[PDB]
Amino acid sequence: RISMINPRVVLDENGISHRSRYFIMLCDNETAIAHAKKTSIWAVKKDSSKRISDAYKKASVYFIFVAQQTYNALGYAQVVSDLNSTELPFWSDSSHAGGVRIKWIKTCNLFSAEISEIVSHMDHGSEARDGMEMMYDEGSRLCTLINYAIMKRIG
Known part of the structure; x- marks a missing residue:
């Protein structure tokens, strides 16, 4: 099983790479995304925490940030720490299991019909x-589309 866009990437039964794994973060809070872009912390939901933490131990993990109401691209980042119940951002609620540190790769606020x-x-x-x-x-397409949209916007 090989990626349709990259012949050098082997995929598992689910179409997921063994080495690079991607999760979408749908944000509806301007304060939360602004805070995360400034402090490089995200809050992980209890519902998806186990799969995200297991992926963090096995591969490189990336969060792709998209606005809930518009699907505007907000950027993407690598997860660079495992879930921590004592490092939750202030905007987190009861639905969150813990925080993770992230390393921002791209940050923006734009719309792409392809995204x-x-x-x-x-x-x-x-x-x-x-x-x-x-x-x-x-994930590969979304990251490329974000890079390309940021690129074209600067011009």
Whole structure:
């Protein structure tokens, strides 16, 4: 099983790479995304914490940040620490299991129709669920689209 966009990337049964794994973060709080972009911390939901923590121990993990109401691209970051119940950001609530440190790769606030299309179909054809893992080809495409949109915006 080989990635459709990268012949050198082997995929598991789910279409997920063994080495690079991608999760979507759907944010509806300007204060939370602004805080995360300044302090490089994110809060992980209890519902997706086990799969995200297991991925952190096995591979490189990236969060792709998308606005809930618009699907605006907000950036993407590598997760660089495991879940910690004592380092939760101030905006977290009872639905969060713990915080993770992140390392921002790109940060923006823009719209891409191509990005919105991918997020709109990420749940096997339906709208993405917050915290879900995506396929390798979706994460690779989204990161490239963010890089390309940032690139074109500076011009």
